Each structure stands twice: as C-alpha cells, then as structure tokens.
Amino acid sequence: KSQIPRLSAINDLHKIWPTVEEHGAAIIESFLSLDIVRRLNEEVDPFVKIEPIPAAKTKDHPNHVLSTTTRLVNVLAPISKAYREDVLNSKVLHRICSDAFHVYGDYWVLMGAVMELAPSNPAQPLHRDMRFSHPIVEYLKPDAPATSINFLVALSPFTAENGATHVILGSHKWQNLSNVSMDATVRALMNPGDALLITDSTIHCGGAETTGTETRRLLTITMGISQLTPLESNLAVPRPVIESLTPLAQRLLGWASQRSAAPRDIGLLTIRGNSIEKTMNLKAEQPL
Amino acid sequence: KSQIPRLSAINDLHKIWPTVEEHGAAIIESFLSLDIVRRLNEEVDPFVKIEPIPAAKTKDHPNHVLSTTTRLVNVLAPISKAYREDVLNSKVLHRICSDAFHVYGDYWVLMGAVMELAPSNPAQPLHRDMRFSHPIVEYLKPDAPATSINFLVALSPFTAENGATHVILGSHKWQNLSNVSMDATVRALMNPGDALLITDSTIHCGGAETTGTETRRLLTITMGISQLTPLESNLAVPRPVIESLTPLAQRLLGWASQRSAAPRDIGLLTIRGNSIEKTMNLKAEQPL
Numbered sequence: 267k268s269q270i271p272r273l274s275a276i277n278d279l280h281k282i283w284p285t286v287e288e289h290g291a292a293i294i295e296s297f298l299s300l301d302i303v304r305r306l307n308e309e310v311d312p313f314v315k316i317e318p319i320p321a322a323k324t325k326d327h328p329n330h331v332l333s334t335t336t337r338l339v340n341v342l343a344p345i346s347k348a349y350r351e352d353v354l355n356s357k358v359l360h361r362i363c364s365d366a367f368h369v370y371g372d373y374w375v376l377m378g379a380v381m382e383l384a385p386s387n388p389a390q391p392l393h394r395d396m397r398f399s400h401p402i403v404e405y406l407k408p409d410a411p412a413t414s415i416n417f418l419v420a421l422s423p424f425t426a427e428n429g430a431t432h433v434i435l436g437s438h439k440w441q442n443l444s445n446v447s448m449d450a451t452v453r454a455l456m457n458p459g460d461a462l463l464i465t466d467s468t469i470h471c472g473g474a475e476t477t478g479t480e481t482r483r484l485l486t487i488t489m490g491i492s493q494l495t496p497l498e499s500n501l502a503v504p505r506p507v508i509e510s511l512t513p514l515a516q517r518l519l520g521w522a523s524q525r526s527a528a529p530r531d532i533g534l535l536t537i538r539g540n541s542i543e544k545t546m547n548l549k550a551e552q553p554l
Numbered sequence: 555k556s557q558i559p560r561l562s563a564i565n566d567l568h569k570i571w572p573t574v575e576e577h578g579a580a581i582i583e584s585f586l587s588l589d590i591v592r593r594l595n596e597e598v599d600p601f602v603k604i605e606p607i608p609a610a611k612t613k614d615h616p617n618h619v620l621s622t623t624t625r626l627v628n629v630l631a632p633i634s635k636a637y638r639e640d641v642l643n644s645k646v647l648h649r650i651c652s653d654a655f656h657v658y659g660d661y662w663v664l665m666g667a668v669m670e671l672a673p674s675n676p677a678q679p680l681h682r683d684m685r686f687s688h689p690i691v692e693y694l695k696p697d698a699p700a701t702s703i704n705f706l707v708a709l710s711p712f713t714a715e716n717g718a719t720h721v722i723l724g725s726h727k728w729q730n731l732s733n734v735s736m737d738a739t740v741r742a743l744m745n746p747g748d749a750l751l752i753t754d755s756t757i758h759c760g761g762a763e764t765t766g767t768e769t770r771r772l773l774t775i776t777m778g779i780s781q782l783t784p785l786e787s788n789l790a791v792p793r794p795v796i797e798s799l800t801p802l803a804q805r806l807l808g809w810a811s812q813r814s815a816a817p818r819d820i821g822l823l824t825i826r827g828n829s830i831e832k833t834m835n836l837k838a839e840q841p842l
C-alpha cells in the first residue's frame with residue numbers, strides 16, 4: 267500500500283496543500299529547523315512537567331478523552347519565544363493555510379499545543395479531530411473544503427515502535443466508515459522538525475508506545491478558519507508579550523479583527539466598523 | 555396567505571422556538587417592556603447620531619452592504635445599562651436559544667446592534683443573513699439545525715408604510731431559490747418592544763420607507779452557537795463594566811470559556827484545562 271507523501275518545505279512548497287487535498291496527509295520534511303525544535307523543547311520543558319493529568323479534578327474544563335499519562339500544554343505564546351516568533355510567522359505554514367482556506371477567508375490558530383506521551387501509551391482509537399469541541403463540523407456537506415487542518419510536528423523521533431502517528435490515506439473523502447481499520451493505516455515516521463499535515467476529515471490515530479522506555483513529544487498546531495472558535499484562549503496573555511508579536515501573529519492569537527472571503531465582507535470581531543487593533547491602538551514588534 | 559405567527563413572551567414561551575422551526579419566523583409580543591425600550595433608546599441615542607456612514611473611508615472594516623443613510627451601532631454593552639443587564643439576561647431570549655442550540659452546545663451574541671433607518675430608506679434585497687461574514691454556513695447540510703438566529707426587536711413602530719420587515723414563511727427550508735419574490739412575503743407589523751425572530755436560513759428583508767418622514771429603529775440580536783466567531787468584539791470593553799455583568803452575560807460577550815454539546819466536550823477558549831473566568835479570576839455582578 268501507498269506510503270504518506272514526503273515533501274520538502276524548501277522546494278515543494280506549492281505541492282504541499284494539493285498533496286494533502288488529494289491524499290488526506292503529507293509529511294513536510296524539516297518543517298521546523300533543529301534550532302527551533304531545540305528552543306521550543308527547552309522553553310516548554312518545565313510547563314509539561316508541572317502539567318496535571320488531562321482530567322484533573324482541579325480543572326474547570328477537564329479533558330476526559332486523552333489517556334491519563336498524557337500531558338498537553340497549550341497557550342504557548344507566553345511560554346515560548348520560539349513559538350510566538352518563529353512558528354507563528356512560519357512562511358511554510360502561512361503559504362499552506364492560505365492555499366487551504368482561501369475559499370473561506372482569514373485563518374487563525376484553533377490550538378497550538380505541546381503533547382508529551384508517556385512510555386507504554388496505548389494507541390488512540392482511529393478518529394477525526396474536532397468532534398469533542400466543534401459539533402458544527404459534522405453537519406458540513408461531504409465536499410465542503412476543510413475548515414481546519416492539523417500540523418503534527420515531531421519534537422522527538424516518531425518511530426513505529428514508539429507510537430508514530432497512523433493515517434488512512436484517502437479517508438478524508440470517506441462518507442461510509444465501515445472500512446475503518448488499523449489494517450488500512452500507514453505510519454508517519456519522522457525526525458524532529460518534520461511535520462505530518464492532516465485535515466479535520468483525515469482518519470488517524472496516535473500509535474502505541476511499545477518500548478516502555480521512550481517518551482514521545484509533539485507540537486500540534488490546529489489551524490482553522492477565523493469563522494470557527496479556537497479551542498484555546500489568549501485573552502489572559504499579557505499585553506507586552508502580545509505587543510512584541512507581528513501583526514500576523516497577533517491576528518492568529520485572536521488579538522485582531524478577522525475577514526471572510528465574501529466579496530463585500532463585513533468582518534469578524536469588529537468594533538463599530540473598526541478593527542480591534544485600530545480601536546485599542548495595539549502596537550506590534552515591540553521588544554520586551 | 556398565512557401571516558407571521560404571534561406569540562406571548564409570558565404565556566407561549568415553550569411554543570416560540572417550535573413555531574420558528576416550523577415556519578421560519580414568529581413575532582414575540584412584548585419581548586422587551588416599554589421601560590426597557592425607553593432606557594435602551596435614551597442610552598444609544600447619542601451614539602447613533604455620531605455614527606458615520608456604514609462604509610465611511612475612515613473605517614477599517616467598512617460595511618459596503620448597508621444603504622448609505624443607515625446607521626448601525628454595535629458593541630452595546632459599554633453604551634447601555636439596559637442592554638447589558640436586562641436584555642443580555644432576558645429569560646425569554648435564553649429559553650429560546652437553549653431550545654434552539656441544544657444540539658450544538660453553548661451559544662453567545664454574534665452581534666447586538668441598534669440600527670436606525672432614515673426616511674425614504676429603500677427595501678433591502680431579499681436575503682439570508684450571515685453571507686457577508688460566515689461563508690462556512692453556506693456549506694452546512696440542508697437539514698442542519700440553525701447555527702444562528704436573529705431577534706429583530708422594534709425600538710419604534712414597524713408599519714407597512716415605514717418599512718416593516720418582510721419574511722417568506724417556510725423559506726428557511728428552501729433549497730431551490732427560484733420562487734424568491736416579494737410576492738411571497740408577509741410583513742412584521744410590530745409595536746415597540748415586539749420582536750421578530752428568524753433563523754439564518756429565513757429569507758427576508760427590511761421594507762421600503764415610503765412616508766419620507768418616519769425614522770425606524772431596531773435592536774438586532776444575532777444569537778449563535780459558541781463555535782462560530784462573533785461579528786463584533788468585546789475585547790476593548792473595560793474590565794469594570796465586564797465585572798458588573800452576570801456570569802451568563804459575561805459568557806455571551808466572549809469573556810468566558812464555552813462548551814460544546816459533545817458527550818466528552820473538551821471546551822472552547824480554554825487555558826490549559828481551565829476557563830478564562832477561573833484563570834483571570836474574573837468577578838461578576840460588581841456594582842460600578
């Protein structure tokens with residue numbers, strides 16, 4: 267059976283989205299440089315260690331889906347300089363998203379999260395993303411263009427034995443889900459910095475960690491149209507850190523108004539005909 | 555032909571949404587009391603007078619759709635005590651919205667706006683709302699439950715001669731739009747405080763002002779699922795005014811996390827498993 271298409275971020279940039287549109291998945295080799303991976307890991311390290319279980323009884327919005335040993339850290343902008351500067355302004359990411367979401371309009375981050383999977387983590391059941399947060403997406407027409415996509419960026423090696431992601435190629439076009447089986451999957455073997463790109467309709471799952479020793483880490487960036495509400499909020503991110511960002515990064519974090527692709531678009535998150543950034547006089551690229 | 559169903563807010567509360575679901579429109583008599591209408595008008599009065607044309611070249615997000623003589627004022631919470639307290643906590647509104655959006659989950663305000671139509675304002679073309687801001691909604695399946703609804707509340711008399719709203723009953727179920735004609739419409743004749751409730755699929759239009767003397771005013775409250783992005787932002791609303799609101803009102807204005815109806819919902823606008831209100835220690839019902 268056919269393996270997941272592997273593409274260069276440097277040379278095959280224009281081919282990435284068309285490949286995902288056709289096959290439902292693609293591996294972007296060296297999506298992030300090893301330098302960026304190093305700084306990202308270093309910066310988020312302590313936050314994953316202090317992170318409680320997904321469904322901790324202390325939590326207001328517990329995640330009852332993730333395995334108890336998994337640790338997920340989101341709202342990365344205040345944590346990571348590498349995230350807020352390098353990945354939020356990624357030329358590759360923005361070309362792909364604009365290719366993907368041009369029919370709808372502006373896009374933003376629905377969630378940027380670092381996930382660390384513990385040794386012996388079981389495989390996730392095969393699934394499509396967004397079904398625990400956006401019931402609306404299930405009511406979209408079969409041939410509706412994807413309203414969100416997910417960059418699954420390896421922050422440590424993804425191998426068959428340590429639970430590399432499974433995908434079913436072509437499953438993003440499936441309506442009948444009777445052929446859903448692990449038999450139909452292929453793996454996303456990836457070095458740190460490589461990214462598996464899927465859509466919200468791609469049937470997939472995290473793999474089983476079978477060594478009992480290896481800890482697998484990833485950065486999952488769900489990019490979606492600005493008409494859909496993010497899973498995470500940046501409302502509590504201090505103004506100085508927000509004002510250190512680029513205007514593009516500010517928009518991605520919901521600290522700007524947004525536009526649809528409607529010919530006479532009237533906009534989203536506006537204030538009496540004016541933008542958030544104009545109204546609040548929000549500065550950009552201010553060193554903190 | 556059949557007139558728009560008229561229902562009591564006091565006695566027919568449970569009948570309102572089922573009526574709209576069947577017919578695409580209903581008039582809620584005395585949705586707001588004359589007291590509330592009086593205070594709302596008094597409070598927004600100066601803001602509509604200073605409001606520039608919809609597509610003013612000074613604006614960041616000009617509205618090129620509205621007639622040039624129309625004035626629209628949104629982000630009403632900081633303007634109006636009556637809006638932020640009485641209408642945002644309306645028992646009738648919240649019963650209707652929970653009836654309407656239970657399949658999806660939480661709902662919030664997509665836009666609360668006062669609109670003043672000038673004398674001799676032409677009729678709007680027949681349309682469905684949301685097509686200039688949320689292209690996504692057009693891609694929803696025909697029988698998908700409505701993801702937004704619009705309360706068109708009369709703040710002055712709605713008459714046939716001064717441009718009362720037109721609706722086509724049953725048009726919310728239409729797929730073929732060849733029978734779209736003013737021939738098929740009925741009017742929403744309303745006293746101040748009455749509300750015309752429609753869905754995002756109800757074909758309708760503002761009527762022609764034919765007297766050349768009367769100024770018509772309305773409060774349009776588009777309520778929609780929390781999975782859809784609002785047309786307006788409350789990000790710049792001062793913290794003291796936000797903290798004077800009820801928790802329910804805070805949620806409606808995007809100053810709280812939100813929940814979907816998914817059995818193991820993971821939430822919207824959360825912060826590492828905790829809500830906005832918990833994280834920021836947001837107070838409620840603090841007199842200012």
Ligand SMILES: COc1ccc(/C=C2/C(=O)Nc3ccccc3C(=O)N2C)cc1
Nearest residue numbers: 331332333390391393395396397398486
């Ligand atoms: C144990 O098996 C699983 C675990 C997760 C999902 C799916 C999701 C999801 O739809 N959204 C995302 C997106 C990024 C990161 C996490 C999540 C997440 O939390 N869940 C629940 C399915 C099955």
Ligand SMILES: COc1ccc(/C=C2/C(=O)Nc3ccccc3C(=O)N2C)cc1
Nearest residue numbers: 619620621678679681683684685686774
């Ligand atoms: C001149 O004819 C028109 C004027 C408006 C619309 C429709 C909308 C709309 O879809 N959303 C709303 C919702 C509330 C209040 C205003 C608006 C609005 O601004 N437009 C553009 C159509 C036709």
Ligand SMILES: [Br-]
Nearest residue numbers: 332333336390
């Ligand atoms: Br997991």
Ligand SMILES: [Br-]
Nearest residue numbers: 431471472473
């Ligand atoms: Br994974």
Ligand SMILES: [Br-]
Nearest residue numbers: 620621624678
């Ligand atoms: Br108008």
Ligand SMILES: [Br-]
Nearest residue numbers: 719759760761
């Ligand atoms: Br109207």
Ligand SMILES: [K+]
Nearest residue numbers: 391392393394
């Ligand atoms: K699942």
Ligand SMILES: [K+]
Nearest residue numbers: 679680681682
């Ligand atoms: K129109």
Ligand code: NI
Nearest residue numbers: 394395470471
């Ligand atoms: Ni997944």
Ligand code: NI
Nearest residue numbers: 682683758759
């Ligand atoms: Ni309308």
